[PDB]
Amino acid sequence: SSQIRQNYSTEVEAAVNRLVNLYLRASYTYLSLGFYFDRDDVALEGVCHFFHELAEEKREGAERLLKMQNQRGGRALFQDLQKPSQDEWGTTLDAMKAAIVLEKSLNQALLDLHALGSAQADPHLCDFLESHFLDEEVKLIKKMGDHLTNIQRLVGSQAGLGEYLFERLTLKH
Amino acid sequence: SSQIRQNYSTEVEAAVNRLVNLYLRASYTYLSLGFYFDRDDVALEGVCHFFHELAEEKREGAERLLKMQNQRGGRALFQDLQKPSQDEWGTTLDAMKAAIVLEKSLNQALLDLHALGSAQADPHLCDFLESHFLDEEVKLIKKMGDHLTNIQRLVGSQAGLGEYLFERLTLKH
Amino acid sequence: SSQIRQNYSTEVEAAVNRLVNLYLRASYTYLSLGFYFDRDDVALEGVCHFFHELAEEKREGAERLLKMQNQRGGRALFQDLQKPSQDEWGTTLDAMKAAIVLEKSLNQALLDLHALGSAQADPHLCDFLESHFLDEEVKLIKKMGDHLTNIQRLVGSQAGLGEYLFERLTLKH
Amino acid sequence: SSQIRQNYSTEVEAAVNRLVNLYLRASYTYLSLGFYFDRDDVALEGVCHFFHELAEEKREGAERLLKMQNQRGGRALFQDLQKPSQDEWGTTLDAMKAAIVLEKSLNQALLDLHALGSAQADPHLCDFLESHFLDEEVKLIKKMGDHLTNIQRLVGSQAGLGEYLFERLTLKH
Amino acid sequence: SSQIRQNYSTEVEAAVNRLVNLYLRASYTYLSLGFYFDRDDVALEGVCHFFHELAEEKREGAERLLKMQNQRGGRALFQDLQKPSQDEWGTTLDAMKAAIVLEKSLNQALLDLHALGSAQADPHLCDFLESHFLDEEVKLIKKMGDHLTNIQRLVGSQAGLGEYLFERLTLKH
Ligand SMILES: [Cl-]
Ligand SMILES: [Cl-]
Ligand SMILES: [Cl-]
Ligand SMILES: [Cl-]
Ligand SMILES: [Cl-]
Ligand SMILES: [Ir+4]
Ligand SMILES: [Ir+4]
Ligand SMILES: [Ir+4]
Ligand SMILES: [Ir+4]
Ligand SMILES: [Ir+4]
Ligand SMILES: [Ir+4]
Ligand SMILES: [Ir+4]
Ligand SMILES: [Ir+4]
Ligand SMILES: [Ir+4]
Ligand SMILES: [Ir+4]
Ligand SMILES: [Ir+4]
Ligand SMILES: [Ir+4]
Ligand SMILES: [Ir+4]
Ligand SMILES: [Ir+4]
Ligand SMILES: [Ir+4]
Ligand SMILES: [Ir+4]
Ligand SMILES: [Ir+4]
Ligand SMILES: [Ir+4]
Ligand SMILES: [Ir+4]
Ligand SMILES: [Ir+4]
Ligand SMILES: [Ir+4]
Ligand SMILES: [Ir+4]
Ligand SMILES: [Ir+4]
Ligand SMILES: [Ir+4]
Ligand SMILES: [Ir+4]
Ligand SMILES: [Ir+4]
Ligand SMILES: [Ir+4]
Ligand SMILES: [Ir+4]
Ligand SMILES: [Ir+4]
Ligand SMILES: [Ir+4]
């Protein structure tokens, strides 16, 4: 409310609600990725676990944004959550490529909101993103890039072997 | 690589490689300062320890920059490391004056890189420097200034006495 | 200084300063090797760790030489540190071959300094090298030779598979 | 005896007996130095302790030589122990200068015996000296040189002040 | 001696001395196998360890036979120990095939000595072999046969890969 709100633009408020929607959509995408790798005809437990953990992390990011919206006196507004872009996610390589495309879209949304906060002279917003989001996203994208390189090295002429070995020896089960 | 790189300018990448070189050069200067105060004809153990700890801290700073270069998808490029500016470092006062000149050159390089990141709208870079470098450097320069004042108070007409007492009663052995 | 110096030739003093430069150059080479294997497009953590540990070990060797220089009353003299011979290090096999070439150059420098100490009738120098350097170097070169053989066995017709498996099952992560 | 003796020259045997005499004489000199600094008109406890510890260390060195003489099948032969060179030892500076002259005479005797062992192709003798004596002597002479430099820095125009402060703040009480 | 000897034939006594020689020869063969797999150009630590443990076990078997020879009042007689049949042992498969040939020769010698004890009505001898040797040998030969099958499965078209993986994932390091 207006009782606490100070230096918190309507533009930032609306962009925070849109970023909550993006993070919840990303969480839903990772929920779908994780259950796909739990199928009996896919059966890669370390890949399931990897994506299920990211579903939780993206939900938590949305909840931290909503907490901050209320700390600044803005009002949460929820929109429909679109379903994920695919029903089946292919190989671990296909899934990791889709994940890094998703993360770079979140990172660009964070950078766009930081730029809006900078333009609005909203240093609390800018610090909030720097402290809780920007480095978490750079670290995650580096880890996904590391995983992509290792998955790609393992395809060789024996793709099933490579997919098994990556799941067994890199990912957590 | 281009697989992870996002919002990371070639200007920042090059300036990070130059700052790694500056931090490694500073580490090498402090290595030389510390071994000079271990000479049998100098023999000030607390001064040796002070500079040897700074050699480690500046190496660690370079390694954190290199880690960040790879997290952003830039490429580390190493150059020759120039030898320190002196082979013998004079009195503890001379050495502490040389140290604060070195630290203010590092601090200005940090501030210049922060300004470049600001101009490039690179908030991850700016936060990285604010979080791991800028306050560490202000604290160190304050401590060196405190030490300079105490060393200067102790010169009096008995410079050897004063140098001994500072090493014994302020510095760590 | 001349206050403590005894049986410590100017030839040995100068050769110890050159060996410090060689060890620091080797440390710098291993720093570069380790950050190359941390690139997102290389991404071999066990290889990164292997080389980063050697960077530390070679720095420590240089510092033990400098300590000994001062214990004998010689004077440390630092020179420029040349950059490593490559900016990119190829495969783990290429990197391990470069590492064993580097180590055999250090070992020959140790053996040359031992021979000079022998010729100068400097038994403290000879014992110092025997006690802290010669067996450490033989052990390291044996381990690198063991690793080269295992890497070479794994190339087969599936080089990426082999590189992954060596990193996962031999090297430490 | 001839029952165990092997590769142990009569020259080395005699030189070991002479070195025992030198170490016992050095022990006796340090006994005198320590009791002089315990006089009520001298009264420098940290200096007393420093020299009394060296009296013990030099006795222990003689006893290790005698143990080795019997392990090699040589025969200990004792000679008269000459009294120390002074009855009163002056200032801490005078005493530390006398101590480093004494230690460099012991070190030259060690180096001479090592050279004789080398010439006699007696590697057990050479290793024994390298392992238990040569580095102990280099470390001690470095510490004495460090102390001389600090004592000299403290003389200034207030020699009594400096002598008190060195004893209080460097030496152990 | 005749003071304790009872029901212990000269035939059994001589055959026990021959079996000691066979076990010591087997120990020597396993010593050679283990050091071959420690070569830098072979470098299979789990294979080294496997054979070095068998060298110890075969020595211990010989020592238990010698203990029993003296408990029965026979007299140990030692013969020359022939060197192993090869200086280089080929692949892990070649080495494991040589090991099972060696073990089946030991097992046949045990069975022959049991038959002699049976014929001599020497139940202490027969029980001694049943209790300490016959099942140990059946268990070892089963384990070697298990290993041969797994090594053979791994040759495929990538023999170096298979040899590495067997050493890493079956044998102990
Ligand atoms: Cl709606
Ligand atoms: Cl260059
Ligand atoms: Cl220069
Ligand atoms: Cl007499
Ligand atoms: Cl014979
Ligand atoms: Ir799951
Ligand atoms: Ir799951
Ligand atoms: Ir799950
Ligand atoms: Ir900002
Ligand atoms: Ir693991
Ligand atoms: Ir987990
Ligand atoms: Ir597991
Ligand atoms: Ir030091
Ligand atoms: Ir130091
Ligand atoms: Ir140090
Ligand atoms: Ir900023
Ligand atoms: Ir400290
Ligand atoms: Ir690393
Ligand atoms: Ir590393
Ligand atoms: Ir590292
Ligand atoms: Ir030598
Ligand atoms: Ir393991
Ligand atoms: Ir480790
Ligand atoms: Ir005393
Ligand atoms: Ir005393
Ligand atoms: Ir005493
Ligand atoms: Ir020698
Ligand atoms: Ir103290
Ligand atoms: Ir003490
Ligand atoms: Ir005290
Ligand atoms: Ir081994
Ligand atoms: Ir072994
Ligand atoms: Ir072994
Ligand atoms: Ir039977
Ligand atoms: Ir074992």
Q: What is d(CA E17, CA E13) in angstroms, rounded to the nearest whole number?
A: 6
- Spell out which residues of chain A touch residue B7, defining contact as CB-CB under 8 Å: 107-108, 111
Annotated ligand binding at E63? The verdict is: yes
Question: For residue B156, what is the nearest residue in chain D, using CA coordinates?
Answer: D156
Cα-Cα-Cα-Cα torsion A94, A98, A99, A101, nearest 10 degrees, comes to 140
What residues sit around ligand 21, an ion, with C-beta below 5 angstroms?
C 126
On whether the CB atoms of residues C66 and C20 are closer than 8 A, the answer is yes
Task: Verify whether the Cβ–Cβ distance D134 to C121 is below 8 Å.
Answer: no
DSSP designation for D82: P
Neighbours of chain E (3+ CB pairs under 8 A): C
Structure tokens, A22: 């993006």
What residues of B are in contact with residue C28 (Cβ under 8 Å)?
Answer: 78, 81
Tokens of A3: 């009782």
Method: X-ray
Kindly report the number of other CB atoms within 10 A of residue B121's CB atom. 14
Q: If you measure from the C-alpha of residue D170 to the centroid of ligand 32, how many angstroms do you get, rounded to a whole number?
A: 52
In the beta sheet, which residues pair with residue B81?
A: C81
Chain C interface residues (partner A, CB cutoff 8 A): 40-43, 45, 157-158, 160-161, 163-165, 168-169
Question: Which region holds residue E88: left if phi is over 0, alpha if psi is between -120 and 50, else beta?
Answer: beta
The rounded Å distance from CA D114 to ligand 27 centre is 7
CA distance E22 to A168: 45
D22 alpha carbon to ligand 21 midpoint, in Å? 26
Residue C1 distance to chain D (closest CA, Å): 9
Identity at D106, one-letter amino acid code: L
At E7 the three-state DSSP class reads coil
| Interface chains of chain C (3 or more CB pairs under 8 Å) | A, B, D, E
Alpha carbon distance C38, C46 (integer Å)? 10
Nearest residue to B133 via CA among B68, B82, B79: B68
d(CA E1, CA A147): 74
Preferred mutation among A138, A151, A153 to probe B, highest tally of B CBs within 10 A: A138
Query: Using alpha carbons only, how large is chain B's radius of gyration in Å?
Result: 18
d(CA A18, CA A109): 9
D53 is an annotated ligand-binding site residue: yes
Q: How far is the CA of A118 from the centre of ligand 33 (A)?
A: 66
Nearest CA in chain E to C140: E40
How far does the centroid of ligand 2 lie from the alpha carbon of residue B23, in Å? Answer: 18
CB-based contacts of C122, cutoff 8 Å, min separation 6: C7, C8, C9, C12
CB contact under 8 Å between E41 and C145, yes or no, is yes
CB contact under 8 Å between B43 and D154, yes or no, is no
Domain boundaries along the sequence of chain E? 10-170
* Sign, Cα dihedral of C70, C75, C81, C85: negative
Contact E69, E13 (CB under 8 A): yes
* Bridge partners, residue B68, by sequence: none
DSSP character at residue B81: B
Task: Spell C136-173 as b/e; 16+ CB within 10 A means b.
Answer: ebeebbeebbbbbbbbbbbbbebbbbbbbbbbbbbbee
Q: Which SS3 state, helix, strand or coil, does residue D171 take?
A: coil
Tell me if A170 sits within 8 A of A46, measured CB to CB: yes
Cα E67 to Cα A157, C7, E13, E16, E73, distances in angstroms:
59, 59, 12, 11, 10
The CA distances from residue E94 to B17, E33, E86, E90, E100, in Å, are: 53, 11, 11, 6, 10
Residue indicated by tokens 């022959």: E112
C-alpha of residue A158 to centroid of ligand 12, in Å:
22
Residues C157, E160: C-beta atoms closer than 8 Å: no
Neighbouring-strand partners of residue C81: B81
Measure CA B50 to chain center.
Answer: 12
Least Cα distance to C129 among C48, C28, C45, C15 occurs for C15
Inter-chain touch D165–B160, beta carbons under 8 Å? no
How many CB pairs below 8 Å do chains B and D form together?
A: 42
Q: Nearest-CA neighbor of B41 among D23, C76, E33?
A: C76
**Token code pair at residue B30:** 């402090």
**Whether E35 contacts E44, CB under 8 Å:** no
Q: Which of A16, A111, A101, A1 is nearest to A63 (CA)?
A: A16
Q: C71 vs D115: CB contact, 8 Å cut-off?
A: no
- B162/chain D closest Cα distance in angstroms: 9
Task: Tell me if there are at least 3 CB pairs under 8 Å linking chains C and B.
Answer: yes
Of the residues C158, C163, C171, the best mutation for testing chain A's interface (the one with the most A CB atoms within 10 Å of its CB) is C158
To the nearest 10°, the Cα dihedral for B168, B170, C3, C6?
100
Tell me if A57 is assigned to a ligand binding site. yes
> In angstroms, what is the span from residue D55 Cα to ligand 24's centroid?
12
Say whether C73 and D145 touch across the interface (CB within 8 A).
yes
Count CA within 13 A, CB hemisphere, residue E112: 12
Over the range E101-132, which residues count as b (16 or more CB within 10 Å of their CB) and which as e? ebbeebbebbeebbebbeebebeebbebbeee
Residues 6+ apart with CB under 8 A from A69: A13, A16, A17, A20, A75, A76
Please name the fold of domain A10-170. Ferritin (1.20.1260)
Binding residues of C for Fe cation, as ranges, are: 53, 56-57, 60, 63
Cβ distance E173 to E49 under 8 Å? yes
Q: How far is CA C99 from CA A13, A58, A136, C50, D129, in A?
A: 56, 43, 35, 11, 36
Identity of the amino acid at D2: S
C-alpha span between D132 and D114 (Å, rounded):
12
Report the residue of D153, D154, D172 to disrupt the B interface, i.e. the one with the largest count of B CBs within 10 Å: D153
Of E36, E92, E164, E168, which to mutate for an interface test with C (greatest number of C Cβ within 10 Å)?
E164
- Residue partners of E126: CB distance under 8 A and separation at least 6: E114, E117, E118
Instruction: Give the amino acid at E45.
Output: E
How far apart, in whole angstroms, are the C-alpha atoms of residue A85 and residue A87? 7
B48 CA from centroid of ligand 15 (Å): 6
Report how far ligand 35's centroid is from the alpha carbon of E49 (Å).
Answer: 7
**Could you count the other beta carbons within 10 Å of the beta carbon of residue E21?**
17
Q: In chain D, which residues have their Cβ closer than 8 Å to the Cβ of C3? A: 100, 145, 148-149
Residue C90's contacts (CB-CB under 8 Å, 6 or more residues apart) are none
The residue behind tokens 């800018």 is A126
Residue A106, classed as helix, strand or coil, is: helix
d(CA A132, CA C58): 38
Q: What are the chain A neighbours of B126 within 8 Å (beta carbons)?
A: 130
**Nearest by CB to C158, which of E43, E158, E169?**
E158
Q: Is B13 annotated as a binding residue?
A: no
